[PDB]
Scaffold this active site. Structure first.
Site, PDB file in Angstrom:
ATOM      1  N   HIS A 114       0.830  -1.207   0.000  1.00  0.00           N
ATOM      2  CA  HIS A 114       0.000   0.000   0.000  1.00  0.00           C
ATOM      3  C   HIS A 114       0.873   1.270   0.000  1.00  0.00           C
ATOM      4  O   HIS A 114       0.791   2.076  -0.930  1.00  0.00           O
ATOM      5  CB  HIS A 114      -0.981   0.124   1.143  1.00  0.00           C
ATOM      6  CG  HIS A 114      -1.907   1.328   1.105  1.00  0.00           C
ATOM      7  ND1 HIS A 114      -3.101   1.242   1.720  1.00  0.00           N
ATOM      8  CD2 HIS A 114      -1.737   2.677   0.806  1.00  0.00           C
ATOM      9  CE1 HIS A 114      -3.514   2.497   1.947  1.00  0.00           C
ATOM     10  NE2 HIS A 114      -2.878   3.406   1.216  1.00  0.00           N
ATOM     11  N   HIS A 118       1.755   4.128  -2.904  1.00  0.00           N
ATOM     12  CA  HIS A 118       1.731   5.587  -2.769  1.00  0.00           C
ATOM     13  C   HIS A 118       3.026   6.177  -3.309  1.00  0.00           C
ATOM     14  O   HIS A 118       2.980   7.139  -4.066  1.00  0.00           O
ATOM     15  CB  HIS A 118       1.405   6.095  -1.357  1.00  0.00           C
ATOM     16  CG  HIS A 118      -0.037   5.939  -0.939  1.00  0.00           C
ATOM     17  ND1 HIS A 118      -1.130   5.899  -1.785  1.00  0.00           N
ATOM     18  CD2 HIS A 118      -0.500   5.833   0.356  1.00  0.00           C
ATOM     19  CE1 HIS A 118      -2.205   5.712  -0.989  1.00  0.00           C
ATOM     20  NE2 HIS A 118      -1.894   5.718   0.318  1.00  0.00           N
TER      21      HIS A 118
HETATM   22  C1  LIG Z   1      -3.267  -1.893   3.074  1.00  0.00           C
HETATM   23  O1  LIG Z   1      -2.532  -1.684   4.254  1.00  0.00           O
HETATM   24  C2  LIG Z   1      -3.024  -0.761   5.154  1.00  0.00           C
HETATM   25  C3  LIG Z   1      -2.961  -0.877   6.537  1.00  0.00           C
HETATM   26  C4  LIG Z   1      -3.509   0.125   7.323  1.00  0.00           C
HETATM   27  C5  LIG Z   1      -4.119   1.243   6.764  1.00  0.00           C
HETATM   28  S1  LIG Z   1      -4.849   2.521   7.805  1.00  0.00           S
HETATM   29  O2  LIG Z   1      -6.303   2.553   7.512  1.00  0.00           O
HETATM   30  O3  LIG Z   1      -4.509   2.244   9.214  1.00  0.00           O
HETATM   31  N1  LIG Z   1      -4.085   4.030   7.249  1.00  0.00           N
HETATM   32  C6  LIG Z   1      -2.680   4.005   6.678  1.00  0.00           C
HETATM   33  C7  LIG Z   1      -2.695   4.040   5.178  1.00  0.00           C
HETATM   34  O4  LIG Z   1      -3.828   4.043   4.594  1.00  0.00           O
HETATM   35  N2  LIG Z   1      -1.589   4.234   4.448  1.00  0.00           N
HETATM   36  O5  LIG Z   1      -1.497   4.471   3.173  1.00  0.00           O
HETATM   37  C8  LIG Z   1      -4.922   5.183   6.801  1.00  0.00           C
HETATM   38  C9  LIG Z   1      -5.324   6.128   7.940  1.00  0.00           C
HETATM   39  C10 LIG Z   1      -5.950   7.370   7.325  1.00  0.00           C
HETATM   40  C11 LIG Z   1      -6.309   5.469   8.890  1.00  0.00           C
HETATM   41  C12 LIG Z   1      -4.170   1.335   5.378  1.00  0.00           C
HETATM   42  C13 LIG Z   1      -3.632   0.353   4.571  1.00  0.00           C
HETATM   43 ZN   LIG Z   2      -3.042   5.320   2.007  1.00  0.00          ZN
END
Ligand SMILES: COc1ccc(S(=O)(=O)N(CC(=O)NO)CC(C)C)cc1
Ligand SMILES: [Zn+2]
Ligand SMILES: [Ca+2]
Ligand SMILES: [Ca+2]
Ligand SMILES: [Ca+2]
Ligand SMILES: [Zn+2]
Length: 159
Positions: A114, A118
């Site tokens: 993820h 980005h």
């Molecule tokens: C796919 O792996 C992930 C793990 C946690 C999250 S999260 O929801 O805890 N967070 C981090 C993230 O999205 N990073 O890019 C967003 C936050 C706004 C809660 C997002 C993606």
């Molecule tokens: Zn994100």
């Protein structure tokens, strides 16, 4: 005339290694996370522990020079961006958390895919099989692939 990379070459670097796991595991998770996108996208990544890199993996805990930054266990899992100045490129993981290679709590590799997406330059997908989403969903590192949806997003890195 002519083309035309954006990047082609993605040199990357870690600043510190989380003690929660052994270093090899730490770079392994991230290595594989990188490798994922490097298979679908033409972006040719290379980790260098020694030299100059385009992007940087930050591991901090609590306040690191962001407003939100961190929150220990939960909240933000991690924060990274591609197309932006300064910090843009760089990917900041929740060191304060206890990441695991196995399913455990949060999987390093999983969040890494993820955030590293980005880093390439991906505006958050809206599909739960896709990994680019803002959400989290436990995925099998056995099955290990990206969603058709997600694949469109990533091909959108040109353009
Ligand atoms: C796919 O792996 C992930 C793990 C946690 C999250 S999260 O929801 O805890 N967070 C981090 C993230 O999205 N990073 O890019 C967003 C936050 C706004 C809660 C997002 C993606
Ligand atoms: Zn994100
Ligand atoms: Ca957190
Ligand atoms: Ca940067
Ligand atoms: Ca930790
Ligand atoms: Zn940050």
């Amino acid at each position: 005339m002519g083309p035309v990379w954006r990047k082609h070459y993605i040199t990357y670097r870690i600043n510190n290694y989380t003690p929660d796991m052994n270093r090899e595991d730490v770079d392994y998770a991230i290595r594989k996370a990188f490798q994922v996108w490097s298979n679908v996208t033409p972006l040719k990544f290379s980790k260098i522990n020694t030299g100059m890199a385009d992007i940087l993996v930050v591991f901090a805990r609590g306040a690191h020079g962001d407003d939100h930054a961190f929150d220990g266990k939960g909240g933000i899992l991690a924060h990274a961006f591609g197309p932006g100045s300064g910090i843009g490129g760089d990917a900041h993981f929740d060191e304060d958390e206890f990441w695991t290679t196995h399913s455990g709590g949060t999987n390093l590799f999983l969040t890494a895919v993820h955030e590293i997406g980005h880093s390439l330059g991906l505006g958050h997908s809206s599909d739960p099989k896709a990994v680019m989403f803002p959400t989290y969903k436990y995925v099998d590192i056995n099955t290990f692939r990206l969603s058709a949806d997600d694949i469109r997003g990533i091909q959108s890195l040109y353009g």
